[PDB]
């Protein structure tokens, strides 16, 4: 009976006033453990203050943020109630992952693939979460496309945050060399990511979600280029002086959200500033090509399935207002394609929607860009959007979405049938 946390999740995700800095700190930490550890106190205080002033659970939009909050913020800086809410979110993830596979029968492997992967797409590495932070451990049949060609292991080059990297920052706009962190998501957290993005998010948000990316290079060289951040010694003068030092944009972003009396605004700004060193790159949209498993591959052998994911991006549930001019809307999936958010983010999309009001609906019938519009080659098709667009926000809806990903392969049919499913 985890219900009270899911009501909180529904209230916070559908909230119009979801804070601006949540997306910025999500992209700044980038899902890296060290970056979160550097900003550990700031996010805890921000969560506490935001929950106190507004009756919602923030940071819920990003899986990496919620899981690192549930893990690291347990020792201190959070009250037991909020920590229990985040832990309950992780527990819902684990509970539905148990339902995903057939734990009683999946002892064995076929073609050096785990026998649970053949049952459900949640356990298959060829299915990627729509939002990516780290590349997966398994790449046996997955050909990832960055511009045109598949990415040879020589084009992937790890970024090192500690020293220099001027040409990497210069290459931010470029696409062909896919810079990654030197970490690889394991199968368990891969399944957790898939669960959070496919089962939990559209069920709770009723498909009203959307994705966006930032021109972060131009944003940070004016949000943090103030002389206050440059001359950091190894505050407490006045509020107005702090506002003039920090700038109008950061004042709008942070003023009341992480600025308790035990720590003036400038200290919170410095805390956010140190995290920038894990700067990442611009948003990118990656294409995933993969042939099906060796049991599904009996019919249509040449079927290379096309799947699209977002890298160095964010998943958002409301349009930003202080970060508008530095943000780009990228509707790519049949989830995360709310016409309203992208219309508020960009003028051309707004004009297209106003010309065609019937596209304003959210049942997955919104016209995706021609590059992304490959429904048949995708793993998830129209019925998933249609069902999620009107399903109730019960946890059973999440587990129903998980159940729908049970595969059609003959081995999957055998494993379902022996369990009498």
């Amino acid at each position: 009976d985890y219900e009270e946390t899911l009501r909180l999740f529904k209230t916070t995700v559908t909230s119009p006033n979801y804070p601006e800095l949540c997306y910025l700190v999500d992209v700044l930490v980038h899902g890296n453990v060290d970056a979160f550890l550097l900003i550990r106190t700031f996010v805890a205080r921000c969560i506490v203050n935001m929950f106190h002033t507004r009756q919602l659970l923030v940071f819920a939009h990003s899986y990496a943020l919620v899981t690192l909050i549930a893990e690291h913020l347990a020792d201190g800086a959070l009250p037991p109630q909020l920590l229990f809410h985040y832990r309950n979110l992780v527990a819902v993830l684990r509970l539905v992952t148990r339902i995903s596979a057939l734990p009683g029968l999946n002892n064995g492997q076929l073609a050096e693939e785990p026998l649970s992967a053949y049952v459900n797409a949640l356990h298959d590495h060829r299915l990627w979460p729509p939002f990516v932070t780290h590349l997966p451990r398994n790449m046996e049949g997955v050909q990832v496309v960055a511009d045109r060609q598949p990415l040879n292991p020589a084009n992937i080059e790890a970024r090192h945050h500690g020293v220099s990297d001027v040409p990497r920052l210069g290459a931010m706009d470029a696409d062909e060399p896919l810079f990654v962190d030197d970490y690889r998501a394991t199968d368990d957290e891969w399944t957790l990511q898939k669960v959070f993005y496919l089962c939990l998010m559209p069920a709770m948000t009723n498909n009203r979600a959307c994705g966006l990316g930032l021109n972060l290079k131009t944003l940070l060289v004016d949000l943090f280029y103030r002389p206050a951040f440059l001359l950091m010694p190894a505050p407490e003068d006045s509020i107005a002086a702090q506002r003039q030092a920090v700038g109008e944009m950061l004042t709008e972003l942070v003023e009341d959200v992480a600025t308790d009396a035990h720590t003036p605004l400038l200290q919170a700004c410095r805390e956010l500033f140190l995290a920038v060193q894990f700067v990442g790159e611009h948003v990118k949209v990656l294409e995933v090509r993969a042939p099906l498993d060796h049991a599904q591959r009996q019919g249509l052998p040449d079927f290379i399935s096309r799947q699209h994911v977002l890298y160095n991006g964010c998943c958002v549930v409301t349009a930003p207002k202080t970060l508008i001019e530095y943000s780009l809307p990228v509707p790519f999936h049949r989830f995360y394609s709310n016409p309203t958010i992208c219309a508020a983010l960009s003028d051309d999309i707004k004009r297209y929607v106003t010309e065609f009001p019937h596209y304003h609906r959210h049942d997955g019938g919104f016209p995706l860009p021609t590059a992304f519009a490959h429904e048949y080659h995708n793993w998830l098709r129209s019925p998933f959007s249609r069902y999620s667009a009107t399903c109730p926000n019960v946890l059973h809806s999440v587990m129903t979405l998980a159940a729908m990903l049970y595969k059609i392969s003959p081995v999957s049919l055998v494993l379902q049938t022996k369990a009498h499913i």
Binding site: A111, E140, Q149, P291, P301, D302
Partner: protein, 471 residues
């Protein structure tokens, strides 16, 4: 397995005359689809030296280097050029293995002792085995030589890949009772496995180096001079550009005739028009569509697809017969009353290929087939689809279409059917380039097909792995 051993034996037998050494290749789902491997008929290879000269053409230069002059009678050299290009292509021995496997485990499961430096397993869904030869005119082999690869399917379709020696032999040349050769071949095994890429970096294929290969012992010499590789690069640039210079010739012809006619374009395709349509928007859409066609034209544009059948050997005899049948006076009454019935004139319907470009959304279609017939009541052209349906893209205001006739006449069309007409000038290029880059495959007899030409095709052989292996 057996193809590599047999090819080693066969190249050893003939190295005295041909002086080709064998190169063993295995290919996977990166070069060809599972359908193409399941339905492969022939594998072919052709060697091009650093001077850009094919192995099978005269060394000092040939008459094919002379240009062709657009006439259908001597169609790009006639049958003799086809025979020369037939002679230059050589055929290899190949096998198809349709079930998923990894080469390391498969060879270990066979009698061959693999001895690679590290036991990295390489998996593939299907394997096609082949061995190609590359010729050294003397005991010296050059690193600027390039080898071409072709896979041929029963429908006559084929795909071209070419890679140069220095990628094939990047490190190989630097690594330097009675026994049956099979026994020592299996007991000596293989140890080095490398990936090779096409010059365009489009196909990945694996090469196997068996230590007991006969080419080892000849103590042959290898070198790659820098000017030699520069020559290879510029020759490759010359080879790759054929379709693009043809498209540019079409562009320049279009602009030239648009200048010549003063911009007044007469109708050539039948379509109803209106005096009170804004035609300025149509003209600007024509400009944008023309620019987009210039941008997105590909090797599969209609002009190249129409040039391709002109090169087949039947074209020259067909052109002679058609011209002689047109070169006739009025028939005498004697032949009308007595003797055979009259020769059948050219049909009232024709087969065409066209490029259609759209301005409303960025979209073009290139390998479009269309059937052309003349409207009797007006004498203008009507475009019909392959099933007989009428093509409506003429009415669509956002569309401009380029048509090409079998006799290399091309129509450029904007909305309303008002057209720009000119002839294709294949004068710009040597006969060698047109005849080498594009030419229809001509079938050579093999298993499962009638010896009598023209008979109905039997069931496609289709060596497959979804069935139990046949014997």
């Amino acid at each position: 397995m057996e193809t590599h051993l047999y090819s080693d034996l066969a190249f050893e037998a003939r190295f005295a005359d041909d002086e080709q050494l064998p190169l063993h290749l295995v290919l996977d789902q990166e070069v060809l689809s599972n359908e193409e491997a399941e339905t492969l008929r022939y594998v072919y290879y052709r060697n091009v030296d650093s001077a850009g000269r094919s192995t099978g053409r005269a060394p000092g230069g040939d008459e094919d280097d002379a240009p062709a002059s657009d006439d259908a009678e001597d169609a790009v050299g006639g049958d003799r050029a086809f025979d020369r290009e037939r002679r230059t292509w050589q055929r290899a021995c190949f096998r198809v293995l349709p079930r998923p496997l990894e080469l390391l485990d498969y060879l270990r499961q066979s009698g061959l002792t693999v001895t690679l430096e590290k036991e990295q397993r390489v998996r593939m869904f299907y394997a096609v085995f082949t061995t190609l030869g590359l010729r050294c005119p003397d005991n010296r082999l050059s690193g600027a030589q390039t080898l071409h690869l072709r896979l041929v399917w029963p429908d006559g379709s084929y795909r071209d890949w070419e890679f140069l020696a220095r990628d094939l032999l990047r490190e190989e040349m630097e690594a330097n009772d009675e026994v049956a050769r099979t026994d020592e071949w299996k007991g000596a095994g293989v140890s080095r496995l490398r990936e090779v890429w096409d010059v365009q970096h489009r196909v990945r294929l694996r090469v196997l180096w068996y230590v007991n290969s006969f080419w080892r012992s000849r103590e042959l010499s290898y070198d790659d001079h820098e000017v030699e590789l520069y020559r290879a690069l510029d020759a490759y640039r010359a080879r790759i550009a054929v379709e693009y210079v043809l498209i540019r010739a079409v562009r320049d012809e279009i602009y030239a005739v648009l200048r010549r006619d003063g911009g007044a374009l007469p109708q050539r395709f039948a379509c109803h028009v209106s005096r009170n349509m804004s035609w300025r928007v149509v003209w600007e859409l024509c400009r944008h569509a023309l620019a987009l066609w210039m941008d997105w034209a590909d090797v599969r544009s209609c002009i190249i697809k129409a040039l391709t059948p002109r090169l087949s050997r039947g074209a020259a005899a067909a052109a002679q017969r058609a011209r002689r049948q047109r070169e006739r006076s009025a028939p005498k009454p004697q032949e009308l009353l007595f003797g055979p019935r009259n020769e059948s004139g050219p049909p009232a319907e024709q087969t065409w290929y066209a490029d259609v470009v759209r301005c409303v959304r960025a979209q073009v279609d290139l390998g479009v087939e269309v059937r052309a017939a003349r409207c009797p009541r007006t004498g203008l052209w009507i475009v019909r689809d392959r099933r007989g349906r009428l093509r409506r893209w003429l009415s669509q205001p956002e569309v401009c279409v380029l048509y090409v006739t079998p006799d290399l006449d091309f129509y450029w069309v904007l909305p309303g059917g008002f057209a720009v007409s000119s002839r294709v000038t294949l004068h710009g290029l040597a006969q060698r380039a047109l005849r080498d880059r594009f030419q229809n495959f001509e079938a050579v007899l093999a298993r499962g097909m009638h010896v009598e030409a023209g008979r109905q095709e039997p069931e496609t052989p289709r060596v497959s792995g979804r069935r139990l292996p046949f014997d």
